[PDB]
Design a protein around this ligand. Structure first.
Ligand SMILES: [Zn+2]
Length: 106
């Protein structure tokens, strides 16, 4: 009833960096596309892979999920316009590839 080795002990190393870290960590695990991709490739992806590819997954959700080739969102700065970003597992790292907007097909 009395855990002698309580793991609830914060390491003294906690700069504002960790505040970003925990924020983005949650933010990534808060996006709907991420949920779908996670379970899609959960057999391949590991927890650590997520934290390693954190930057990618966070940049993924932060950018335009859609594209102006379909949406009238002119306020979204897209350079890979005509495409949409999707996550892909490449070895031990998760990358962001663009697939062509299906709206190009009628
Ligand atoms: Zn589109």
């Amino acid at each position: 009833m009395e855990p002698i080795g309580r793991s609830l002990q914060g390491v003294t190393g906690r700069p504002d960096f960790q505040k970003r870290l925990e924020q983005m960590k949650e933010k990534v695990m808060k996006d709907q596309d991420v949920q779908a991709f996670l379970k899609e490739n959960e057999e391949v992806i590991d927890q650590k892979m997520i934290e390693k590819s954190l930057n990618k997954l966070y940049e993924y959700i932060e950018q335009s999920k859609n594209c102006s080739y379909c949406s009238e969102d002119e306020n979204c700065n897209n350079l890979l316009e005509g495409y949409h970003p999707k996550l892909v597992v490449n070895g031990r790292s998760i990358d962001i590839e663009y697939y062509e907007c299906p709206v190009k097909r009628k």
